[PDB]
Design a protein around this ligand. Sequence first.
Ligand SMILES: Cc1cc2nc3c(=O)[nH]c(=O)nc-3n(C[C@H](O)[C@H](O)[C@H](O)COP(=O)(O)OP(=O)(O)OC[C@H]3O[C@@H](n4cnc5c(N)ncnc54)[C@H](O)[C@@H]3O)c2cc1C
Ligand SMILES: Cc1cc2nc3c(=O)[nH]c(=O)nc-3n(C[C@H](O)[C@H](O)[C@H](O)COP(=O)(O)OP(=O)(O)OC[C@H]3O[C@@H](n4cnc5c(N)ncnc54)[C@H](O)[C@@H]3O)c2cc1C
Lengths: 394, 394
Amino acid sequence: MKTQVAIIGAGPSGLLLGQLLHKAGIDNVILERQTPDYVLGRIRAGVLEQGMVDLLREAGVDRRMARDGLVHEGVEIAFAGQRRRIDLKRLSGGKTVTVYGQTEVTRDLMEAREACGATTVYQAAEVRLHDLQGERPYVTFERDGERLRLDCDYIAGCDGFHGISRQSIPAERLKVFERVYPFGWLGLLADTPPVSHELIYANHPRGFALCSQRSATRSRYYVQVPLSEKVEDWSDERFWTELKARLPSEVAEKLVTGPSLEKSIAPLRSFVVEPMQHGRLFLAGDAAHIVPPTGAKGLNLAASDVSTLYRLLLKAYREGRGELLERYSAICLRRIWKAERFSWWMTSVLHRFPDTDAFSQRIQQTELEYYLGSEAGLATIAENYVGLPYEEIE
Amino acid sequence: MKTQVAIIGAGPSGLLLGQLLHKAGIDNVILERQTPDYVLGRIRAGVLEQGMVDLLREAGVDRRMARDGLVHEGVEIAFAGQRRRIDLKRLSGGKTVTVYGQTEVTRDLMEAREACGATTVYQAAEVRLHDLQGERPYVTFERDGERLRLDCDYIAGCDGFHGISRQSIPAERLKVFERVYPFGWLGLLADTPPVSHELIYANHPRGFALCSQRSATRSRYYVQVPLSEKVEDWSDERFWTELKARLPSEVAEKLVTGPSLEKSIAPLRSFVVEPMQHGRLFLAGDAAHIVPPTGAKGLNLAASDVSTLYRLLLKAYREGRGELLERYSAICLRRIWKAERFSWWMTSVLHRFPDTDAFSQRIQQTELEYYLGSEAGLATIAENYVGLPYEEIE
Ligand SMILES: Cc1cc2nc3c(=O)[nH]c(=O)nc-3n(C[C@H](O)[C@H](O)[C@H](O)COP(=O)(O)OP(=O)(O)OC[C@H]3O[C@@H](n4cnc5c(N)ncnc54)[C@H](O)[C@@H]3O)c2cc1C
Ligand SMILES: Cc1cc2nc3c(=O)[nH]c(=O)nc-3n(C[C@H](O)[C@H](O)[C@H](O)COP(=O)(O)OP(=O)(O)OC[C@H]3O[C@@H](n4cnc5c(N)ncnc54)[C@H](O)[C@@H]3O)c2cc1C
């Protein structure tokens, strides 16, 4: 087989890139290790930045989102028995965020891809990348036992943190920056109405808690738990009891509980690689960087990498300006580092760290008191939360 | 002897409090361990907040300052070979800071006190505090061998970090928060013209550097040095060479060097005690808290403690409202913690820490890039730098 752009991975990144590309007349093939069902089983993200919402519209896949997505103009932060609302819309100069689950976005993209008839090979086993610096790179994979070869001009690694693409770049050409946090997030999805019309991030002495949502009748809650925890040790009831213990009394009082549709523990980590490309290979999304969940930046940074890669590829194909692709990493990294700083900051002010001295606890509290009580402080959170602007290019 | 308010310490705090008090008709006696000459030999502070400038005017000791003080509308931060100016005046809504040395302020207050004829006992040896919870506390000291007793209604501990007042409060009644930094500031005072009309804080790979001033012909420079350093190991020439290596080329190029008038190493530390009072004893200034030099908050927080203590004492004496004094600590601590957070933040983004991993260095750089490039970010620095408002009281 032959194509123009080979895409490794059919998660949000790969699908969004493939859709934008297909629409502009640039053929592309997506190779995915798993089955459609497996991919669709991942809950993950719930909050989308306006930039992501616009990219979905550009890809022509925004019908269901415009109908079912919930637009939020603010978020709350609870600490020391007090709730403080950050008016995102007012403080950011009018931007908002949209709550629409990653499962839904992924479903929307998959349906859109099927209808247009673009190529997607699921269960593509043992993908290998070859001749990354040649003028003609290629991908080999196994489909039901037979090893097939796919020739292409460029390869976009949209295979997530454990993908093959980042591993295919000579380790010496890469610089890695990583921080592992001593805790994880225990999440629970339930078919119960959310306790509030807006999200509530809570810093409590017992640990972090977050009240989120997926729709008017589906909620997503999270509690900070140490890394030693096994999800089998958390019955639905133990979780609700713990959640309630971490929320302000008036919030825990009106919480509608129910059986879990899904429960899982996500460990927190920060990770960035520089550069994000090697030869004809370009990394995007979780393949190039991981941000802790706090602040909802992961899927949102993937979207900007994608927006940037798509536009550079368009220039290369439509305008014969292939030299612009050398700028990919420089452009992406500027936004990646600022979002990493934001997620890192949010995580550090909202969670309870293990070996914390009295001075640090007081500074943590004061950070909250300052940023939440100052108009300039509220504005730094707000502009960061809605998402910093995308870089123009050229 | 008998007085109304006994003040331990004749540094800025004690003198300013005594002056405000004397002027309002509240007798007070100041006891100081050292000689006037010794106190006057301490260089220290150079930057004053507007609140401090106003307090000096209220105390009627602002003639020389209004004449010789330099008003600054901005400060610069240099990092990664780029200088960025923070327009304090524009970004804070019109406030500025005033550069007038602590030595001068102290000299102005001492002269003002002498002229009014208020009591000041220098070389008051081995001061001890007694009956702090009684209705009649007293202070004993030694003057040329004889142990004398001073009776008073209240005692204000303005004796700095190593003073006797904080040590006189039963250790169990106090909560201490402290952070010691793994570096100090090597400062050099010279009769040379400053390299710039505004201060320049510089983050450089070799360590922190700061270009300050005292007048049109007197400069004050600082460089970060490890705690193992002895000032005798730093010749004037070694210092200038090191300073120049840390500044942007265009700044080091026009630097006028010269012999040191004073050289010394100040170790960095954060320290706060809660509460700041015990019975008839009230702590103010360095006796109650220490902030690292970064941000110029030390002498400025002492001024607000003083402003607060003076006004509460006025209420107690003039209005017979002695119960209001129980609010001293609560009022002071609100401002102290926010200033501590600011000094801590400045210190952490401008200095080079010893065991720093790649992720942290990049976050440090990104913190600078974000706050210095965002209007909301610049505003958080600016409003903090000029000094947060004083709490009203009652
Ligand atoms: C608890 C949680 C909450 C989050 N909340 C938010 C939020 O609200 N907002 C937000 O912005 N972000 C959030 N994120 C982050 C977001 O979910 C991720 O950044 C997003 O999944 C990245 O998409 P991706 O396509 O880059 O990678 P992935 O979603 O991981 O998909 C990569 C795909 O590549 C496939 N693949 C892997 N290896 C191979 C291979 N060898 N060959 C072929 N295919 C392969 C995988 O099977 C997978 O389907 C959250 C994440 C978590 C865990
Ligand atoms: C390098 C440096 C730079 C700084 N830069 C700035 C700046 O630009 N702006 C700013 O806001 N702050 C700055 N500070 C902080 C500022 O100098 C201090 O906060 C200030 O000195 C506090 O004054 P004070 O009167 O509370 O205490 P001190 O100045 O320490 O005076 C306390 C007095 O009490 C006396 N005393 C001590 N023990 C006894 C006793 N047992 N009996 C009687 N008397 C006693 C002492 O001799 C001393 O005279 C800086 C400090 C340093 C070290």
